[PDB]
Amino acid sequence: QEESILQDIITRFPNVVLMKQTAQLRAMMTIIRDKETPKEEFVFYADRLIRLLIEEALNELPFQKKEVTTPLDVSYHGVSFYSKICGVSIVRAGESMESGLRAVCRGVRIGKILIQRDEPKLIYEKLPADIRERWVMLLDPMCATAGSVCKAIEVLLRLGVKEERIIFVNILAAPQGIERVFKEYPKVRMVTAAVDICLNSRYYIVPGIGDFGDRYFGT
Amino acid sequence: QEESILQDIITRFPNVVLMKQTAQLRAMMTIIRDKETPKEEFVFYADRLIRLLIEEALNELPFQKKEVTTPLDVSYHGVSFYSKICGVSIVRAGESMESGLRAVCRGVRIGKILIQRDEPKLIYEKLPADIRERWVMLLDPMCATAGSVCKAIEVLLRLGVKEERIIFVNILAAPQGIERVFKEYPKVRMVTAAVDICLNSRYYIVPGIGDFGDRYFGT
Amino acid sequence: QEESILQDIITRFPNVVLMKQTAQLRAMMTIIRDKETPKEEFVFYADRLIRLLIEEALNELPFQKKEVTTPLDVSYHGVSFYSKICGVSIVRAGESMESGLRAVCRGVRIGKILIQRDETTAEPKLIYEKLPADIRERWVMLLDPMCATAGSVCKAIEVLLRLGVKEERIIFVNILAAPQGIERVFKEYPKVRMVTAAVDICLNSRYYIVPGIGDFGDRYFGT
Amino acid sequence: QEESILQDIITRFPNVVLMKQTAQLRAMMTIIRDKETPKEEFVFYADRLIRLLIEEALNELPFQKKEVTTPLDVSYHGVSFYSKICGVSIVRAGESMESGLRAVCRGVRIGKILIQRDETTAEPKLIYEKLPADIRERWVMLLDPMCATAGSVCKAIEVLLRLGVKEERIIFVNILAAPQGIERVFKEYPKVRMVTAAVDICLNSRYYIVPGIGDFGDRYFGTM
C-alpha cells in the first residue's frame, strides 16, 4: 500500500521531512491529482497547499533565543530566526511556489534556474550575488527522477552555497527520485507533501498529478 | 511549569487540540507578544498565525472517502469534505480571523456577535439564516475568563446549533479559560495556538499579548 | 436615462467624485447587481471594486512635492503623501472595505461605528464604537457601501465631528447611492468629500435603491 | 518640456494608453524610483501599481451589452466580457506583473517567452518558450514592465504572429517606456495596443530609460 512506501523513506532517509498526512491535506491532494477539476481550482488548492509547505519548510532554518517583554510588562522565552536566506526556483515548475514564499517571507530575494534536457543542461539563470552566504530554499514541485534538481544543486555548489544549507521544498516525489538526490548529495534537506509508488513508462509520477507547470499555468 | 499546564489540559480536556509547538510557531508568537512590534508588523504576523489556525481547525470537520483518477489513468484514493460551514466572529477581536478563514474558504458565510459587559450581554448579532444546520467556526483570539465565548455559545445553542458542531478557533488561552467552556459546553471542540500560565488582577492573560483587539486595529 | 442623473449631481455637488464609468467598471457592477451570481462570485467582484474605489479615494488627500534620486543618478520631480489617516466603517456594511483599505495602506488604523435605526421611531441611534485615540488629528475614510436615505451616514459623521475630526477632513467612500442620500449629506455637512462608483435614480416603497443591488451586507457576508 | 514629449507620442501613436497621472500614481512612481528604498517597499508599491495597470488594460477588450435582474426584481442594462485571453510574460521582468494579472483574472493562462540579445550580434533571439496551444484564438496581454529600445518586445510580438496571433488582439501592458521604444513597436506592428503608466524622455548608452528606475527585474527579485 501507501504506508509501506512512506515509512521506508522515513526510516532510510533522515534529512527528508514528510508533512503530517492530515485529512485536509489528502483532500487538497485529491482535488489537484484529479484530472477533472478546472484550472481555477487547481491553482487555488495548489497555492493553498504550497503555502502550507513553505511554513513547514521555514522550520528547518536555524533559530536563536530571544527574550521579550509583554505589554503586561512580563517576559517571555521567545525564539528568533536570523540567517540570510533566498528562494531559488527551477524555471516554470518552481515559479509556482515563488508567490507562496513572498507571502510569508516578504521582499525575499528570488533566484531562477532553467534546467533544460535536449544530460540535463543549464540555460538561463539569475541568482543573488551573495547566494553563497545564505541558506537556499530549492523550489521544485515534482521530483520524478531527480535529474534537474540534481543539476540545480550541482550548479549551486559550484557557485559556493553549502550543501548542508540547501532545503529542497517539494510537493510530489518518487522513491527513486528521493534516493538519487540523497545519494548524489546527502546533507541536504528535503520537505515534501507526498511520495508516490513509482515512475511511468515515461518519466511521470504514479499515481501522480500529471505535468504541474502545464496544469498550473494553463498549457 | 509551562510544560505541566499543557499536560493537565491535555489529559483532562481531550477535546482541546493544541497546534504543534514548532520553532516557527514560537517565532511568530514571540513577535506578536513583544510590545515593541509596530502596527504593520503586528498584523502581518498575526495574519500568518491565524492562517495556520483556520487550517488546523478545518481538520475537525467530517470527511468521506472519494476516488478520482490522475491524468495517467490510474486511480487515487482521496477524501473530501461536505457538511457546509460558516464562521461566527465575536465582534472586533474575532473579526481579525475572518480574512484568514475566507482565504482558505472562499465566500464561506460569515456571522457576527457583539457581546458587551453590562455580566456579558448580547448587543447585536447577524448570523446566517441557515446556521442551525451547519458546522460553526467560532472566532475569538483571546480566551481569558471565557465569559464572552460562553455567552456566544448559549446564543448559538438557543438558535438550534448542535453543541458538538462548534469548533472554537482561539489564539491564546488561559487554564481557567478552558475549564469554563468545557464545563458549560463539554461537547464543543477547541483549537488554540498557545496556552498560557495565568490571569492577573485585571483579568488579562499573562504573559499574554495584551489587548489583541486594539493592537490589531488602532489601539 | 442614467446620464441625465449622473450629470445633475456632478453639477449640483462639485464635492462628490464619481468614478470613471468604464467597461470594466460597468461590467463588475452588473455582475454584483445580478441577483443570480453566487455568493463566492459576488465577493470576488466586490473586493475587486472595493479596491478600485479606495485607490480613487486616496487622491483626495493632500500631497507635497518630493524630489528623488534614481539609480541612473538623476533627480525625479515627484510628490508624496503625508497626513496620517484612518478608516472608519459603519458596522457590518463598511467592514467589507477594511481589508481593501488595508491592502493599499499596510496596517492602517481602522475604527468601527455601529449605528442602529430604532424599532419604533426609526431613529438613527449609536450602539457601539471604537475609533483611534487621536482620530481628530487624522483624515478619515468613512466606509459604507450603500447610501439611500443617508440617515446612518449623517449620524456617523455627527459622532466624528463631536470628537474633533474636521468635516472637510472626512472622505466618504461609497459604492452605490441614490440622489436623495447625497443631497442630504451635502446639505447637512457641506465640506465632506464623497467618492462613489455609481448613483442610481430613486428608492422603492422599502427605501431600497432600486436599480440597486439589494442588501450589500447580507450579499457580501452571505448570512 | 515633459508635456511636450507625452503630447507628441499621444497624437502620433493613437494606440498608446497613457494611464491617468493621478497624484497617487505620481506618488507610487516616486517611491519605486528611489534608489534609496528597500526591496520589500519596492515590491509592495510595484505590485500595487501593476494591479492598477492591468485593470486599465482589461478595458482594451471587447464587451457586449447584457441585462440582468436585481434582487429588487428589476432589470439592469450592463455589459459583459468574453473573448478568451491569456498572458505572455517575457522571462523575469514580465513575470513580476503575472500575479497581478491573476489577482483580477483568476485561473488565467500564462505563457512565458525568454528572449535574449546575442553574444556578439547583440540582436534579440528566442531561447525558451511555453505558450497556450490555443493562443491563436485568444487575446494576448503581453507583459513587460520596460520598453527601452523595444528589441525584446518586438522579438516577442514576432513569435506570437508566427503562431497565428492577430496583431490587434495584442495588448502590450507596460509601466515605464522610452519614446524610441514606442516608435519601434508602432513601426513594425501598428495594430498592437499599448497601455503604459509612464513615458520618460530618453535612453542612455547602457540602454536604460534615463530618469527611469534602473533594472526593474534586478530590483524586483533582489538579484543586484
Ligand SMILES: O=P(O)(O)OC[C@H]1O[C@H](OP(=O)(O)OP(=O)(O)O)[C@H](O)[C@@H]1O
Ligand atoms: O525593450 P528593450 O530595449 O529590450 O528594453 C527593456 C527590456 O530589457 C530589460 O531586461 P534586463 O536585461 O535588464 O534583464 P532581467 O530584467 O530579466 O534581469 C527589461 O526588463 C525589458 O525586458
Ligand SMILES: O=c1cc[nH]c(=O)[nH]1
Ligand atoms: O511536471 C512534472 C515533471 C515530471 N514528472 C511529473 O510527474 N510531473
Ligand SMILES: O=c1cc[nH]c(=O)[nH]1
Ligand atoms: O487578555 C485579554 C483578555 C481579553 N481580551 C484581550 O484582548 N486580552
Ligand SMILES: O=c1cc[nH]c(=O)[nH]1
Ligand atoms: O438598497 C439598500 C439601501 C440601504 N442599505 C442596503 O444595504 N441596501
Ligand SMILES: O=c1cc[nH]c(=O)[nH]1
Ligand atoms: O529601462 C531599463 C533598461 C534596462 N533594463 C531594465 O530593466 N530597464
Ligand SMILES: [Mg+2]
Ligand atoms: Mg528581464
